[PDB]
A paper describes a structure:
[name] exhibits the typical eight‐stranded antiparallel β‐barrel structure, with two α‐helices flanking the barrel on either side, all of them connected by loops. [name] shows remarkable sequence identity with human CypA (~52% of identity) but has a 40‐aminoacid N‐terminal extension. Here, three new structures of the protein in complex with the three non‐immunosuppressive derivatives NIM811, dhCsA, and [name] have been solved at 1.17, 1.20, and 1.20 Å resolution, respectively.
[name] (Debio 025) differs from CsA in the residues at positions 3 and 4. It replaces the sarcosine (Sar‐3) moiety at position 3 and MeLeu‐4 residue at position 4 with N‐methyl‐D‐Alanine (MeAla‐3) and N‐ethylvaline (NEV‐4), respectively. Thr117 exhibits a displacement of 1 Å in the carbon backbone, a phenomenon anticipated due to [name]'s additional methyl group at position 3. This alteration induces a slight shift in the L108–140 loop, with the most notable effect observed in the residue Thr117, the nearest amino acid to the methyl group. Specifically, [name] displayed the highest interaction affinity with [name] (Kd = 15 ± 3 nM) while dhCsA showed the lowest affinity (Kd = 200 ± 92 nM). Of note, the affinity of [name] surpassed that of CsA (Kd = 82 ± 15 nM) (Favretto et al., 2023). Similarly to NIM811, in [name], the side chain of NEV‐4 creates steric hindrance, preventing it from occupying the hydrophobic Cn cavity and proper interactions.
Residue numbers in the entry:
A (entry chain B): 13 to 211
B (entry chain C): 1 to 11
Write the structure that this text describes.
């Protein structure tokens, strides 16, 4: 189901997304969520994210609940508040959302351990897209990445399910992308979602 | 390489 760049729907070009505010651009019922980011102990700003419920409803709803606190295990909420970005590769992507262990091992979703790939409709055609991290087919969980360049070699292996909105969002993404990392691409100073929610 | 996995990170 993969669309070529010439076939893309309105509202998801880089220019269109950078004009976005707090309301969705691809489909009017798409939720918009946010992360406030701290780099070390410094508030770095806010990333606003449209979740493409119209194209990837299960992936969007999983991410959305992790932003709002609506997913509970035995009455205890769990989600992205306090989650880190544990793997940062300049000119490629920033990876985070492992609220389980903070190291890439976390594989919990609102559906259980892992959930299937939805249709691979959108390509990784530009920076600023949200896509699911996984360990092969049908192993989506809680982790995600934000593209920092086109990464079309990931097409049909990772579901692109959202986009950042507005220029500040991309400024924060670029700041995260350029922090110092160790030999394993782990940041030397933590990058944390200190607050998150739905707009 | 440039993959985004959860568990065995590769080059």
């Amino acid at each position: 189901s993969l669309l070529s760049e010439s076939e893309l729907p309105a509202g998801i070009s880089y220019a269109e997304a950078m004009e976005g505010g707090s309301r969705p651009l691809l489909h009017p019922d798409n939720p918009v969520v946010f992360f406030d980011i701290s780099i070390g102990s410094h508030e770095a700003g806010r990333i606003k994210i449209e979740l493409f419920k119209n194209l990837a409803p299960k992936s969007a709803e999983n991410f959305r609940q992790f932003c709002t606190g609506e997913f509970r295990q035995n009455q205890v909420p769990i989600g992205y508040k306090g989650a880190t970005f544990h793997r940062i590769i300049k000119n490629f992507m920033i990876q985070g959302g492992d609220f389980v262990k903070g190291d890439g091992t976390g594989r919990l979703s609102i559906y259980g351990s892992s959930f299937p790939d939805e249709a691979f409709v959108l390509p990784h055609f530009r920076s600023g897209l949200l896509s699911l991290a996984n360990s092969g087919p049908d192993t989506n969980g809680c982790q995600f990445f934000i593209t920092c360049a086109k990464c079309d070699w990931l097409n049909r292996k990772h579901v692109v399910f959202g986009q950042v909105l507005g220029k500040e969002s991309m400024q924060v993404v670029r700041k995260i992308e350029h922090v110092t990392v160790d030999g394993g691409n782990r940041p030397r100073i933590p990058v944390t979602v200190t607050q998150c929610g739905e707009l | 390489x440039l993959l985004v996995t959860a568990x065995x990170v590769l080059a």
